[PDB]
A paper describes a structure:
In the present study, we determined the cryo-EM structures of a nucleosome-like particle, the H3-H4 octasome, which has unique features not found in the canonical nucleosome. In these structures, an ∼120-bp DNA segment and four copies of H3-H4 dimers formed a stable core particle without H2A and H2B. A novel H4-H4’FHB, assembled by the helix–loop–helix regions of the two inward-facing H4 histones, connected the two disks. First, the H3-H4 octasome lacked the acidic patch provided by H2A and H2B, which functions as a docking site for a variety of nucleosome binding proteins.
Single-particle analysis identified three well-resolved structures, indicating that the H3-H4 octasome exists in alternative conformations. The three structures, namely the open, closed, and intermediate forms, were similar but differed by the clamshell opening angle of the two stacked disks formed by the symmetrical halves of the H3-H4 octasome. The open and intermediate forms of the H3-H4 octasome structure were determined at 3.9 Å and 4.3 Å resolution, respectively. The histone core arrangement and DNA wrapping configuration were similar to those of the closed form, but differed in the distances of the opening measured between the two DNA gyres at the farthest points from the dyad, which were 7.7 Å and 1.7 Å wider in the open and intermediate forms, respectively. The H3-H4 octasome exhibits larger interdisk spacing between DNA superhelical gyres compared to the nucleosome. This is probably due to the lack of the H2A-mediated L1-L1’ interaction and the steric repulsion of the extended unstructured N termini on the two inward-facing H3 molecules. The interdisk spacing appears to be dynamic, as evidenced by the alternative conformations of the H3-H4 octasome structure. The wider interdisk space and the dynamic nature of the clamshell structure suggest that the H3-H4 octasome could provide greater access to DNA-binding factors, such as pioneer factors, which prefer to interact with the DNA along the gyre.
Residue numbers in the entry:
A (entry chain H), B (entry chain B): 23 to 95
C (entry chain D), D (entry chain F): 24 to 95
E (entry chain E), H (entry chain A): 59 to 134
F (entry chain C), G (entry chain G): 59 to 135
The structure:
Amino acid sequence: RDNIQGITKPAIRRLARRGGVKRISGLIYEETRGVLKVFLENVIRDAVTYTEHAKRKTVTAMDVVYALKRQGR
Amino acid sequence: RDNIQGITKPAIRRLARRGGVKRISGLIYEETRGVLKVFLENVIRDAVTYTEHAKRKTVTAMDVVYALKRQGR
Amino acid sequence: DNIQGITKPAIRRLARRGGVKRISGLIYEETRGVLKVFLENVIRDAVTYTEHAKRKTVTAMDVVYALKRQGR
Amino acid sequence: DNIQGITKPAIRRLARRGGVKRISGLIYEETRGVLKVFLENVIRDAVTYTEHAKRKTVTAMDVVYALKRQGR
Amino acid sequence: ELLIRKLPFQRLVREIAQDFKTDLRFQSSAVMALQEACEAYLVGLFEDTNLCAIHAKRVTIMPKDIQLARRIRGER
Amino acid sequence: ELLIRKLPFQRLVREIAQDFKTDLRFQSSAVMALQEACEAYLVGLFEDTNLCAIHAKRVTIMPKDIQLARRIRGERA
Amino acid sequence: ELLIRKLPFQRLVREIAQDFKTDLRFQSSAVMALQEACEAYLVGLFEDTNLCAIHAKRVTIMPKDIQLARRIRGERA
Amino acid sequence: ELLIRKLPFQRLVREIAQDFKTDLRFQSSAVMALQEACEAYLVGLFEDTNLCAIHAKRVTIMPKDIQLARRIRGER
DNA sequence: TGACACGTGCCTGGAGACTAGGGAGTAATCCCCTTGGCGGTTAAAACGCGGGGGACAGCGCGTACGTGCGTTTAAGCGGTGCTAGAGCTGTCTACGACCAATTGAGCGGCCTCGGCACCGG
DNA sequence: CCGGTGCCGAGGCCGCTCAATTGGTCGTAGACAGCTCTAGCACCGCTTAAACGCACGTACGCGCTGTCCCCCGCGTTTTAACCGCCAAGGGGATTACTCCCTAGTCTCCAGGCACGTGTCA
């Protein structure tokens, strides 16, 4: 199965429950996946950039923190 | 004098000459200075970020190239 | 005349959505040339990806990825 | 006191510039409270910069620096 | 163009400053700078409130709309 | 909505494709995807052309406006 | 206690990275850091989305709620 | 030769950096690299402004020309 | 030590508060169709124990690569004054190409049938 | 070793939408001259450029330890996906109830601008 589909329907529901949402329309799930993908792409693009600057082949935890800062947490 | 004033009027004129303009209005100079400052601020902000990631105290040539790439597009 | 299927009133309507109030008669030929170049470039990349993946079928994601990387 | 100096028609004018079609009567008092908070925060930073430089005259650059760090 | 009148705006800015620090003054270009920023802020805030109003089954903006807009922005 | 007609646009896409690859297939959702992008691109290009017209204190867009907008954007012609 | 499943999230992260740069290895604490940030982001977005739903007197959140929240926050939408 | 003066440009670069992070020292080849990029950027901006000036039947560039060039590329 | 902002006077149309008044636009209310929530469940992809490697980040150190101070100075370059030359606009006259109202004519679209590959279980 | 599916390709018929005609005309092309203004010449002052010098801050490269990523057998394992009944609600139409937005009128005043003055860059 596609890897984007591993962000399962019950997982997105749980995130919404933690956000205080009581009922969730069927169209939320596809919308949430799109939003997540955009966020991930941006962060990872910066993260990999940091990795290359350090002349490494393994992205480090520190790479992500700088990526997150320049994205805005 | 102020450090922004070191990009002198004849220097801005020379940049404009290389840009193919034959005559330059008096208001261009202040406008050009503002544009340059915005550009510089942005690049340096990224440049300094790279320096901190590498745990360095000296901004290197490599720091600038990554800053420029992400601002170049 | 498949290039002619992008009619004059359609291009005017697109321009209205773009905020254009007045439209010269010479715009239409110019816009068509511009449009052709755009399409060629995107499709050229799209078909390249299809051949690289040895799939021979243009997918919707291929076009979206091509379009995304074009804008960069 | 000072927020009541700002005129009711001015806030309506601001909404027109913001592309607002209609305005509830209760917005104006609410808007005034919001405005006061914004100014306080910006001015608080502006004065902080002035004090750090051991100056008694607020400069245009002081406000701009305050504004940048507030918008950021 | 500036949308709020200079003198009432100046009085408010001076009033707030008097409470923060004693006898501080402001430059003319400083107040005009603050006013451009202030007018841009209110216009932007009014854009979002209107967007929030349209989301609801109305076209009239209400006090509750601004507070929602400011809460989601992370201000208050 | 799609301000460009669907069927003539699809024919053009197929027409252009015939020169790149012989008898290559397509998908329906692929053409609709390309069209949303295409219409957004043209509308945006028309925005810049209008800015060029207004710069020249005119209200009528001309071929020179399109050519100026694409050159400053970095579009090779 | 992460709410998104660990293994599928990690798989997605590696997939996206391969298009930026191939043959990259992710540190475990790097993925856990990225996942904590992502889930906090989604939960926060759902908090704002819920506020938008309550605003429209609807107990059920809808795509228009997510789109409104991201537009008012300032995210590209 | 770099059309911008080296030493004043370097002073400006250090000033801006000090606000992002204090006590940083710039590598020489880093400043020359930054300056080449800046001069290339300004020259390119001057090319586009001139195209806008010629478009408007003028030969003298004006602030509105610079603002148009930056707007169509997507700077502001 | 001189230039900047503070404080007050004159006033007049621009702008700001009520006072009627029509009403587009709010807010409860019902029925319905939609439509998630929840209960069962079972195969299953996730979680994990652990060997096994081992590629690779983290850390310490030598050193030379180079930045900072700073010091003089001869010298190319910026600032300022002034000038003569060229360029930025309004209202001149005009026209032609751009706008719209009207009418055949044709292609866009809804719904559907017949045939061909095609990755695939 | 054969199969359900998406595809072109066409048709039948309604069906909005073109090109073309004609007319009214808004806006755009030279332009004369008043006006700004600025590119250039000429000094004069001056701040960049540079070469040591010396002192050292530390970045880069290289080697060593670790440690944690990748891999997977593979065992078990809490659970995601699907069906289906149930009940909450989104919403569209209905209808009562406005106060919100206009005009008129009376009043308050924002700013040129000008003069007098305390204070700190």
